[PDB]
Ligand SMILES: *[C@@H]1O[C@H](CO)[C@@H](O)[C@H](O)[C@H]1NC(C)=O
């Protein structure tokens with residue numbers, strides 16, 4: 501049966517009794533999750549109008565959906581509006597107010613999310629911990645955060661996941677466009693990323709799952725961002741990153757690093773000295789091109805001893821800025 505809800509309490513009470521759930525203009529109570537977990541397999545969820553959220557300092561999530569064979573859709577013109585400026589204080593998840601993560605897709609398996617627009621997330625947007633989940637035509641509009649104190653507004657954080665496909669995302673934020681902390685068989689294609697910290701593998705290490713395998717980030721553009729292409733592995737951690745491909749990536753307006761691969765990463769600041777417990781093997785860059793800003797570095801590779809091997813880099817051409825004086829343990833066939 502089809503059900504339309506204009507309040508969160510009714511939707512939560514009746515979600516398992518509905519095979520199509522329409523969420524129309526819901527104001528989600530402060531400090532609570534719009535909890536659409538535990539759906540019956542096959543259910544379709546449609547967001548309509550503007551979903552809003554009450555103000556409270558808490559960790560979230562604002563929205564959570566789970567189940568098998570779930571189809572999540574944003575209707576034309578729909579928005580999930582976090583009004584994140586109520587929390588933004590320049591400090592994100594590193595300090596200041598406690599700020600709620602936006603959208604949990606944990607165990608949203610053999611499922612899809614299409615056409616969702618998120619506006620002004622308080623902090624990170626999608627937390628993905630699922631198998632066989634596609635996210636298509638997603639828009640993250642956090643542009644207000646450029647001037648109003650947005651920080652740590654990651655669009656897609658992935659861990660403990662398999663068979664994730666992200667297609668035609670459009671992101672304007674202040675942190676990673678994608679951050680693959682762990683996972684296997686992951687595709688990001690057709691994306692436009694602006695404002696943030698780039699298309700990132702990692703940080704990898706220091707968690708329960710520190711394994712990244714078979715990831716393709718392709719046919720995408722990164723503009724007006726701190727980094728273009730980034731792989732970050734945690735200083736002193738243990739894990740592995742293998743079979744990663746960046747292909748057909750264009751970048752411009754990059755402030756810090758066009759391409760940065762570093763094995764000294766920490767959330768506060770990298771140490772400057774890499775370690776070798778998170779090997780990066782079978783990394784392919786194919787046709788990664790564009791420009792960096794005058795004060796940026798084109799390519800920076802800071803690998804540990806023996807922990808970067810079997811790389812294939814072809815068609816890499818990054819102009820502007822300066823060449824790095826700091827690269828370490830650069831593999832055969834690769835250059836800064
Ligand atoms: C790598 O991942 C892609 C997409 O998830 C998949 O189509 C492909 O079969 C995977 N390769 C292997 C060897 O599993």
Ligand SMILES: *[C@H]1O[C@H](CO)[C@@H](O)[C@H](O)[C@@H]1O
Pocket residue numbers: 503510511513514515517518
């Ligand atoms: C959720 O919605 C159903 C109708 O779909 C109600 O019967 C229930 O009481 C709750 O309001």
